[PDB]
Write an enzyme that holds these catalytic residues in place. Structure first.
Site, PDB file in Angstrom:
ATOM      1  CG  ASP A  64       5.393 -22.856 -42.107  1.00 47.26           C
ATOM      2  OD1 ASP A  64       5.520 -21.630 -42.301  1.00 47.26           O
ATOM      3  OD2 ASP A  64       5.688 -23.386 -41.011  1.00 47.26           O
ATOM      4  CE  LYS A  78       9.629 -20.466 -40.023  1.00 45.42           C
ATOM      5  NZ  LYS A  78       9.227 -19.475 -38.982  1.00 45.42           N
ATOM      6  NE  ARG A  81      -7.228 -11.317 -24.332  1.00 49.21           N
ATOM      7  CZ  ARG A  81      -8.564 -11.271 -24.361  1.00 49.21           C
ATOM      8  NH1 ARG A  81      -9.317 -12.362 -24.394  1.00 49.21           N
ATOM      9  NH2 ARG A  81      -9.153 -10.092 -24.372  1.00 49.21           N
ATOM     10  N   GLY A 139       0.285 -22.573 -33.061  1.00 51.28           N
ATOM     11  CA  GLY A 139      -0.812 -23.498 -32.796  1.00 51.28           C
ATOM     12  C   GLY A 139      -2.125 -23.176 -33.482  1.00 51.28           C
ATOM     13  N   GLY A 151       1.244 -23.508 -40.050  1.00 56.61           N
ATOM     14  CA  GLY A 151       2.336 -24.434 -40.326  1.00 56.61           C
ATOM     15  C   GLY A 151       1.982 -25.576 -41.265  1.00 56.61           C
ATOM     16  CB  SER A 152       4.076 -28.492 -42.247  1.00 59.13           C
ATOM     17  OG  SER A 152       5.147 -27.715 -42.755  1.00 59.13           O
TER      18      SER A 152
END
Ligand SMILES: O=C[C@H](O)[C@H](O)[C@H](O)COP(=O)(O)O
Ligand SMILES: C[As](C)(=O)[O-]
Ligand SMILES: C[As](C)(=O)[O-]
Ligand SMILES: C[As](C)(=O)[O-]
Ligand SMILES: C[As](C)(=O)[O-]
Lengths: 248, 248, 246, 247, 246
Positions: free
Chosen positions: C10, C57, C141, C190, C211-212
């Protein structure tokens, strides 16, 4: 050791036993047929003396002493059977303590694995008995084999949790994954009536079939028994199976 | 293996040396007590270089790679720990694939047996963390040990059913019955605060205790750590324990 | 298809985009109450700053936002659950577009539905913004366990399996034929540490989104770099250990 | 079957089969509580030898081998039938693996589409059997056709969600939308008793009808079979249907 | 109003002129309990522009409606965003000279509003969110229900009407025309040019937009962008360009 591809037949006397042997059965199941118990030893001995193929009989679930009796009689296999009246609702026989091999019933992989952990040498995947309805056998053979395929291909680190969920011993699941199948032979039983039924159970991944006394209530038992035997052996030969179905 | 011992949480070299000096059998290297992850390798190396006793460190449940990282760092034990934020809700690490031994948590015999089947080399019987309340440890040590005593003395032919009911692998239960105890060391953890607490856990059948950072928030950490160590070793010497309790 | 093994990052501007490219990212995700498609200006700024693919996005079901991004010359459109959904019931019919889409999924049923709508890539992801890898792990999973089941199951059981999963059977049939999903499937949710990124690869991801958080660190280029190397060399635990120190 | 507008008749022997053929049936269905299975091959061969029109027979649901047996016998269509005792409660036969075409039952579009994805070549929209009550057929023909009309006219981008909700394979829905109808023939069955019943099913959008053994329990089977055939073909000729109903 | 158009909320003459200049097909004059606006404010707006002026009344407030009728308003909006005066009965709009616009969330509501005499519909969910999902959910529902009715067997309409809570004669009219017998505009969270064009893509006849326009840095440019996007709703290059400023 139990001839994969084979048919095991219920017999109540020496005459029926000989017919079963002559038709090509890999073994016979000696029966006497309220409370249903181990058969009179006399009847079992009559069947044992009548044939050279293995003789089975089965005992009530949990009935350790019935099993020891059959062991002493020289029976080739003991069937700890759910169609007899269970003697113990909670605990099956500890079959590891015996010389003679046992066949046990199962409806899913959890049961199968628990029976194996108790020392079962062979399995019978079966639903309800005496219906003439194959759906019983099919439901459970589909379930057991679907569950096996899942275990065979699943990530190794997920087996302990899978075992918990199934109620299975993990070491049996590990063995199943290692072999790509159950470590014992697994025959179908429950409503196997026609040659097409018998071949269907083989198509669904059975190692063989059990068939009941219905055979001897037919007009020509030896022909009928024969048709089941050939259909079970040649389970993809649909022309043969079609031909074999005509007589009945 | 390291029975009678105390394992202490340490956040730096200074604390680690104090723990070693007080008689700890090992130390547990931490960053702190949001998302809680494996500690910075730098902090773990600092602790490893500061002492000669074994050094443990924590990974998140199911975090295979965190564990491999600690293995590569030369850590002596990996603690797959429920106080860190679980990485996998369903599957624990397959610890059989590792060189370094693991300690895992458990609240009952079913959990203990599953952790062992995954390859755990040591157990930590523990309830909720950070409370200072020993009831957590006591509840679960009583449960695990009561369940063990039941298994040890129960009729052999009832184990498969017991395993099903507990969610345990039967071969682990069979091993437990054979040895008369768990095949690995089982330490208590959870709220062990006073010398009396530590000795109580030993009275209840623990093999040792884990203690947290509370020790280093006291006025005299080395005396406090010392008191825990002596109480855990001499857990039936009530005069000594009484004397050790006076300071703090 | 995307360089399997890759990291997608990102970025909110040209500076961040260049750092991501320099660190070895396989692509960048251009970003800017109600969360909508980003201002085209910001997306163009990112497109001009780098040579690697640029993603952006749109809100779920927002057909026109997607057409706008397509017109801007974006390389991939991400029909994203972290933006405020525009349609609660119907996703974009991505078959009608030139530009490829990435979509999110939490299980095989969702994955198969996204594919039937024309998705060219998947992102297996739980909840966003937590820094907690459990979200990604749970769903990777689940998806992969369900795939393994389908790959090995009896052919005649697939129609019923499809019904139970809410999946299109032809996608399951294709999965069984290939032994895997017919599109690339990256983990997201995460992914914070190098160990996290490598874990997702261990669990069968084709790559990861990050992410950022990277650009809130003290040394973004070193951090981005560590994620990239960990994701590529996901079984080199000595390297990953070393990369985790900084 | 091939011929839309047609009537398929249940027959237990060569005599009945000939009557059905003579009355204008487009095919016959060879037949023989307790467990109901595939018929004795002898009975099926008797019917096959008796007529030139297609012969159907079927098998128990999921009974792969019964189906292979009928295939080997040279049957023209296999009917994977819910009136026989199901052999498999969860999985129907993978009919794609067969040379002979299958007819399957359905009660709604989701079922229909699942049967098609399993390789069904023809459908039978049917509720409960043996009642003589047409409501069974009507309920389900109305449901299936209403659901088809909805799919045919619905926004293309809503089909994936529609498929999820129905439990249908989306590619079958896409095909339905493309053709404006099911990609296979769909006959009504269940309680079709009078000529008016048969014509009603056609009015409701059936491609044809199945009729049971009731025909041969009448005083004049050939006249009765005939009346059903004519009513099904000329389903909007109410004067004719009125006349045919008198006997 | 005219199809393809944009109707804009205005609180004064200045805003009204801007809206007219931007190409709005009409304006909606606006001023705890929310009631009909002060007539003075409505007259100010009426005098400021040549395009139609709407205002708005509380649901069921027959007299508020008569007041607006007497003021010479061009359309009355029996509006759910004002505080309902009657929870059970809407205005009998057949008794009025001036046409009404009413809200609806599904075809049953639409048909009941029409039976009460509505001359125009506004398909809308929750107001003031800036979230287009409200508009989308209900435009998708209404139009899906219309397509079903248009193609359904004639003899099934009475039962359909019962199930929807609709008057059958309205359903019969809908089947006959292949659409609603009145114009149906989207409303609810229409914020960006892409939003406006999306509603047209989903089958709206036009859009309502709120006061958000006049809280922007350049209202006339923003209003303009919405107008052009709504008119040229398939011109994605234009819409992309129009989105840059905002
Ligand atoms: O009808 C025989 C059934 O399998 C019994 O309920 C059997 O006792 C169940 O096996 P388990 O005790 O392993 O659940
Ligand atoms: C309940 As468990 C995942 O600790 O075996
Ligand atoms: C197709 As879905 C994300 O609404 O289950
Ligand atoms: C797949 As079905 C019609 O047997 O539920
Ligand atoms: C909004 As109404 C009173 O027609 O249900």
């Amino acid at each position: 050791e139990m001839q994969k591809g084979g048919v095991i037949m219920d017999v109540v006397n020496a005459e029926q036993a000989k017919i079963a042997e002559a038709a090509g059965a890999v073994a016979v199941m000696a029966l006497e047929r309220g409370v249903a118990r181990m058969a009179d030893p006399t009847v079992i001995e009559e069947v044992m003396n009548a044939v050279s193929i293995p003789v089975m009989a089965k005992v009530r679930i949990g009935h350790y002493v019935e099993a020891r009796v059959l062991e002493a009689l020289g029976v080739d296999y003991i069937d700890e059977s759910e169609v007899l009246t269970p003697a113990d609702e909670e605990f099956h026989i500890d079959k590891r303590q015996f010389t003679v091999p046992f066949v046990c019933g199962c409806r899913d992989l959890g049961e199968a694995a628990r029976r194996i952990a108790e020392g079962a040498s062979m399995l019978r995947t079966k639903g309800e008995p005496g219906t003439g309805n194959i759906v019983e056998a099919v439901r459970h053979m589909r379930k057991v084999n679907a569950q096996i395929r899942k275990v065979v291909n699943m990530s190794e680190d997920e087996l302990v949790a899978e075992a918990k969920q199934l109620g299975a011993p993990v070491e049996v699941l590990r063995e199943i994954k290692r072999l790509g199948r159950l470590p014992v032979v697994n025959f179908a039983a429950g409503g196997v009536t026609t040659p097409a039924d018998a071949a269907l159970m083989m198509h669904l991944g059975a190692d063989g079939v059990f068939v009941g006394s219905g055979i001897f209530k037919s007009e020509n038992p030896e022909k009928y028994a024969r048709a089941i035997v050939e259909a079970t052996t040649h389970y993809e030969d649909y022309e043969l199976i079609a031909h074999l179905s005509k007589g009945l």
